[PDB]
Amino acid sequence: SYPAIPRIYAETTLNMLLKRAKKPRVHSIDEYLKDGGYQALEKALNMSPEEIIDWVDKSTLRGRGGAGFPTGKKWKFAVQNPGPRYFICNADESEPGTFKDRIIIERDPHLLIEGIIISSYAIGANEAYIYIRGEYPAGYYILRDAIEEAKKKGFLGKNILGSGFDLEIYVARGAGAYICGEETALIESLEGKRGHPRLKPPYPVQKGLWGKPTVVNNVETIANVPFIISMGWEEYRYIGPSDYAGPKLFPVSGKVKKPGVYELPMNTTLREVIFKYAGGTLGNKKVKAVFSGALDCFSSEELDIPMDYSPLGFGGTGTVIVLTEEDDIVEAALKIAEFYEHETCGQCTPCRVGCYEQANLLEKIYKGEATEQDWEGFDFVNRNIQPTSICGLGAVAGRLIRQTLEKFPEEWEKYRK
Partner 1 sequence: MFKTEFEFPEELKTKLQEHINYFPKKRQAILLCLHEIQNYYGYIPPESLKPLADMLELPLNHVEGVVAFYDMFDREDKAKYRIRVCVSIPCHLMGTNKLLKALENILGIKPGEVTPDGKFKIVPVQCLGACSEAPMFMVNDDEYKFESEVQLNEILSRYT
Ligand X SMILES: NC(=O)c1ccc[n+]([C@@H]2O[C@H](COP(=O)([O-])OP(=O)(O)OC[C@H]3O[C@@H](n4cnc5c(N)ncnc54)[C@H](O)[C@@H]3O)[C@@H](O)[C@H]2O)c1
Ligand Y SMILES: Cc1cc2nc3c(=O)[nH]c(=O)nc-3n(C[C@H](O)[C@H](O)[C@H](O)COP(=O)(O)O)c2cc1C
* H or E element at residue 123: helix 109-123
Q: Does 72 bind ligand X (CB under 6 A)?
A: no
Of positions 19, 43, 153, 173, contacts partner 1 by CB under 8 A: 173
* CA 187 from centre of chain: 16
Give the residue at shortest CB distance from ligand SF4: 394
Residue-by-residue DSSP string for 152-196: HHTSSBSSGGGS---BEEEEEE--S-GGGGSHHHHHHHHTTS--P
CA-wise closest residue to 195 among 174, 216, 210, 212:
174
Binding site partner of 106, from ligand Y, Na ion, partner 1, none, Cβ cut-off 5-8 A by kind:
Na ion
Residue 45 in marked binding region? no
> Cα dist. 267→120, 240, 316 in Å?
30, 6, 15
Q: Which stretch binds Na ion (CB under 5 A): 54-62, 95-103, 319-327, 366-374?
A: 95-103
Q: Does 205 bind ligand X (CB under 6 A)?
A: yes
For residue 84, cis peptide bond before it (omega within 30 degrees of 0): yes
Query: Between 86 and 165, whose beta carbon lies closer to partner 1?
Result: 86
Binding site partner of 393, from ligand X, ligand Y, partner 1, none, Cβ cut-off 5-8 A by kind:
ligand Y
Residue 23 in marked binding region? no
Residue 69 in marked binding region? yes
Restricting to residues 173-232, name those near ligand Y by CB under 6 A. Answer: 179, 181-183, 216-218, 221
Residue 190 in marked binding region? yes
Restricting to residues 31-50, name those near ligand Y by CB under 6 A. Answer: none
Gaps in the chain with C–N over 2.5 Å, residue before each? none
Of positions 12, 59, 60, 90, contacts ligand Y by CB under 6 A: 90
Of positions 381, 393, 397, 400, contacts ligand Y by CB under 6 A: 393
Binding site partner of 218, from partner 1, ligand X, ligand Y, none, Cβ cut-off 5-8 A by kind:
ligand Y
Binding site partner of 363, from partner 1, Na ion, ligand SF4, none, Cβ cut-off 5-8 A by kind:
none
Query: Between 195 and 287, whose beta carbon lies closer to ligand Y?
Result: 195
Binding site partner of 195, from ligand Y, partner 1, ligand X, none, Cβ cut-off 5-8 A by kind:
partner 1
Residue 89 in marked binding region? no
Q: Lay out the sheet containing 214-218: strands in order across.
A: 168-173, 125-132, 85-91, 214-218
Helix (H, G, I), strand (E, B) or coil at 311: coil
Residue 199 in marked binding region? yes
Q: Exposure pattern of 335-362 as b/e (b: 16+ CB <10 Å)?
A: ebbbbbbebbbebbebbeebbbbbbbbb
> Cα dist. 413→16, 30, 39, 136, 410 in Å?
47, 60, 60, 40, 5
Binding site partner of 115, from Na ion, partner 1, ligand Y, none, Cβ cut-off 5-8 A by kind:
none
Binding site partner of 352, from ligand SF4, partner 1, ligand Y, none, Cβ cut-off 5-8 A by kind:
ligand SF4
Q: Does 286 bind partner 1 (CB under 8 A)?
A: no
* CA 257 from centre of chain: 24
Residue 280 in marked binding region? no
Cβ neighbors of 255 (< 8 A, separation 6 or more) are 281, 282, 283, 285, 322, 323, 324, 327
Binding site partner of 90, from ligand SF4, ligand Y, partner 1, none, Cβ cut-off 5-8 A by kind:
ligand Y
Residue-by-residue DSSP string for 270-288: HHIIIIIIS-SBGGGPPEE
Cβ neighbors of 70 (< 8 A, separation 6 or more) are 57, 60, 61, 62, 63
Residues that bind ligand SF4 (CB under 6 A): 179, 197, 344-348, 351-352, 389-391, 393-394
Q: Does 63 bind ligand Y (CB under 6 A)?
A: yes
Q: Does 106 bind Na ion (CB under 5 A)?
A: yes
Q: Does 323 bind partner 1 (CB under 8 A)?
A: yes
Query: Are 264 and 247 spatial neighbours (Cβ–Cβ below 8 Å)?
Result: yes
User: What's the sign of the alpha-carbon dihedral 264, 91, 117, 151?
Assistant: negative
Q: Does 283 bind partner 1 (CB under 8 A)?
A: no
CA-wise closest residue to 126 among 174, 163, 91:
163
Interface contacts to partner 1, rule CB under 8 A: 3-9, 93-99, 101-102, 127, 133-138, 170, 172-178, 189-195, 251-255, 259-261, 291, 321, 323, 327, 331-332, 335-336, 338-339, 342-343, 345
Residue numbers in the known binding site are 63-72, 174-221, 345, 348, 351, 391
Interface contacts to Na ion, rule CB under 5 A: 103, 106
Interface contacts to ligand Y, rule CB under 6 A: 63-67, 69, 90, 92-94, 179, 181-183, 216-218, 221, 391-393
